[PDB]
Amino acid sequence: GFCWHHSCVPSGTCADFPWPLGHQCFPD
């Protein structure tokens, strides 16, 4: 999970990559 200033991305970050990675969705 990460927050820059106001925009805080909750833990469980889904980053979309080409397949078969795709939307990874990992604990961060």
- Phi and psi torsions of 2, nearest 5°: -155, 145
Q: Round to whole Å and give the CA distance between 7 and 26.
A: 18
Residue at 21: amino acid letter: L
Beta bridge pairs of residue 8: 3
d(CA 28, CA 12) in angstroms, rounded, equals: 5
Bridge-partner residues for 2, per DSSP? 9
Q: For residue 13, what are the domain limits? A: 1-28
Selection from 17, 27, 21, 24 nearest residue 9 by Cα: 27
Q: Say whether 3 sits in a helix, a strand or coil.
A: strand
How many domains does the chain fold into? Answer: 1
Q: How was this structure determined?
A: NMR
Is the CB of residue 1 less than 8 Å from the CB of residue 10? Answer: yes
CA distance 18 to 28: 20
